[PDB]
Design a protein around this ligand. Sequence first.
Ligand SMILES: *[C@@H]1O[C@H](CO)[C@@H](O[C@@H]2O[C@H](CO)[C@@H](O)[C@H](O)[C@H]2NC(C)=O)[C@H](O)[C@H]1NC(C)=O
Ligand SMILES: [Ca+2]
Ligand SMILES: [Ca+2]
Ligand SMILES: [Ca+2]
Lengths: 214, 217, 218
Amino acid sequence: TGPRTCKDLLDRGHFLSGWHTIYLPDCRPLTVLCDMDTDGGGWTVFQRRVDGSVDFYRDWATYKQGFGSRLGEFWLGNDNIHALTAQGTSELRVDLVDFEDNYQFAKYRSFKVADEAEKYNLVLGAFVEGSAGDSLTFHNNQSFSTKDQDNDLNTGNCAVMFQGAWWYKNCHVSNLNGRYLRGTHGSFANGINWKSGKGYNYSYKVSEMKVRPA
Amino acid sequence: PCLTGPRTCKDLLDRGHFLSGWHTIYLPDCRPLTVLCDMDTDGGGWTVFQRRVDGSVDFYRDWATYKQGFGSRLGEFWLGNDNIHALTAQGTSELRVDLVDFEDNYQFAKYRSFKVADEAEKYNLVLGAFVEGSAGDSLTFHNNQSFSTKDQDNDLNTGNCAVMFQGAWWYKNCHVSNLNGRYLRGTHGSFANGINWKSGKGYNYSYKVSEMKVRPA
Amino acid sequence: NPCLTGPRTCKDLLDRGHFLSGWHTIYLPDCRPLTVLCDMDTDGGGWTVFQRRVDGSVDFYRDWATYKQGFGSRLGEFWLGNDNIHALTAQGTSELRVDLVDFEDNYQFAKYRSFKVADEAEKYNLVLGAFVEGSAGDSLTFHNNQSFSTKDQDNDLNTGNCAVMFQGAWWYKNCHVSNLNGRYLRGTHGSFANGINWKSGKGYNYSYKVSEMKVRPA
Ligand SMILES: *[C@@H]1O[C@H](CO)[C@@H](O[C@@H]2O[C@H](CO)[C@@H](O)[C@H](O)[C@H]2NC(C)=O)[C@H](O)[C@H]1NC(C)=O
Ligand SMILES: [Ca+2]
Ligand SMILES: [Ca+2]
Ligand SMILES: [Ca+2]
C-alpha cells in the first residue's frame, strides 16, 4: 500500500535526497534518509558521519535503538537495520570522503544484520567493486560489540581500545563508528578508518553506509 | 493538554523517535506545531526554540518578527514568542541553554522552570532556580522582565538596550546575557553586542553555537 | 481531497502561519504533490526556492535528464528540476529573486519582475521580466529568451559548448554573465568563469559561498 524502500520512492518520482517515511515488513513506519543521487539512487542510509558533532562511542542500548540527528550524523539503529535487511537481498554501499574531497567507495552484493538474539551478526556477501578496497569481508559472521557488551575475539575489549562500535574480531580492519579524528592521526586505528582505503591512521571526513534491494 | 497525540519532544522520545529533528507536537488543547527535538543532549526530549550556528540569519529584528518566529529549519531560528508562550504556559518546563565556543568547548546552563507570558504582559520571563551548569547563571538577573526589541523598548534603561546591544531579549539595565545578539565570531572589541553570556565567556566573546530548549521538568 | 484544500505555493503556506523556512509539500497545477523549500524569512517571505548552493557537497555538472528531473539533497544543495520549475512558473506571474553570499559575509541580491521557463519541447526557454533592483547588479537579462543547455545538450548561441567550457548548466548564450550552476570553487579562482559567478556582482573569477534562486507569485 505504501513505499517499502527508498528505491520505491525513487521509482515514484522522489528525486531529491532527504528523509522520507517508508514501511517496514511488519508495516511499521520508519523515517529514513534516502540517497537519490549516488550510483543510480534509491539507497537507504543507515550510518552517516560528516562533521564530528555526534558522539559515536555509545553503549549497546543506544546502538540498538539508533541515535544522532536527521540534520547531520546518525546511526539508524540495529533493530531497524535488521528489519530493513532481514527479508530480501539488500546490496551495501559504503561511501567515504577524505579531507581533500576525494571520494572512495566499496560495494557488496548482499548485506544483512541478524536480530538482537544473534547479536546483530553481520552476514555479508561478496565484494563487487570499489576504490576503497574491501575492509569488511574480514568482519563477516561476527557479532556486533559495544563498550558495555564485548562479543569480540580479543582477550581485551576492542570497542574500548578503538573507541567505537562494530563487528569486531581481533580487532578490526574497518572502524567507521570510531572517533571523528580529522585526517591523519598518530593514534592507532581509533578513527573513522578503512584499512584498505586510507589506512589505520587516517580518519575520513564523510562516511555513509547505505542499502538498496538487489 | 492533548491526550490524542504527542505533547512534547519528551513524549516523542518515549514513543521511539530516537533521532533529533523536526517533528509535529500538539500544544495545550489542541494546536499542532512543528518543532526541533533534541533527542541526544542530557537524556533527550528537549524542544529547541532558539538556535544559532553560523550567522546566516539576522537576529536584529522587530517586535512582529520575534512574535511570529523567524529563520529556517535548516539552520538558525527563533520559534516565535507566541509559540514559546503556548509551549511553556503552565506548568514546569525546564530550560537548558547550550553554548559552544570556537574551540569547540561546550558549556551549559539549566533552570528548573521557564515560561514566557503572553503578548499582553510583553512576553514577561518567569524563570525558576538555577540548577547547574558550566556556563554559570547569566539569566536569573533577567527574571520578571519584559521582552524588548529595537522598535519596542520595554527595558529599564533610559535608552534602548536592544539597539545598544544589537539584539532582542528580556533586557533590564540592559544585560548579562544576549543570545539573540550579533554573530560576531569569537573575541570582539565591541562591548556586549555579540552572542554573550557574562558568566560563561563574558561581554567580549560571541559563541559559535547557542541553543535554548525546554523539557517537562 | 488534498490537492484542492492544500497549499499551491510557499506564499499560501506563509498565509496559513508557516513562518519558518523549510521543506513543505505543495500541490502543483496538475495536482501533483511536490516537496519544496520555502523561504519565509527573506524579503516578505513566501518564496519557493528552486536552486541552492551552500557548501559544494553536490555535483552540478550534470546532464540534460538529471537537470530535467532535479537532483541533490534537501539537507543542502539542489536543483529542483526543469519540469518542476516549468510547472511552478507556467501559470501566472512569478517574480524571481536571486540571493548570493560571499566568503566575507557580504550579501547581495537581484530581483526580476517576472520569470518563466517553458516546457521541455521548448528546451526550458527562459522568459525573464525587467530587472527591478539589486546590489548584485543585473547579470540575467543578458540570458533572456535562451534555451537551457547542459554538457550533453548544447542549445546555446556559441560555436562551441558553453556548458563544457564553463562547467555548468544554464540558459547560455555566447556564453554568459551568470553561471550559478557552475563549480563550487570557493572564492577567488584562476580558472575563467567556471565557478558560481555573477559578473556584475563579484565577477568571472569569484565563486560565491551561497546561491539561492527563488520565485513567488506576483
Ligand atoms: C526569442 O528568440 C527567437 C530566436 O530564438 C526570436 O525569433 C525571431 O524574432 C524575430 C523578430 O523578433 C524574427 O524576424 C525572426 O525570424 C525570429 N527568429 C526565429 C528563429 O524564429 C524571438 O522573437 C525571441 N522572442 C522574444 C520574446 O524576444
Ligand atoms: Ca573481548
Ligand atoms: Ca528604555
Ligand atoms: Ca553551441
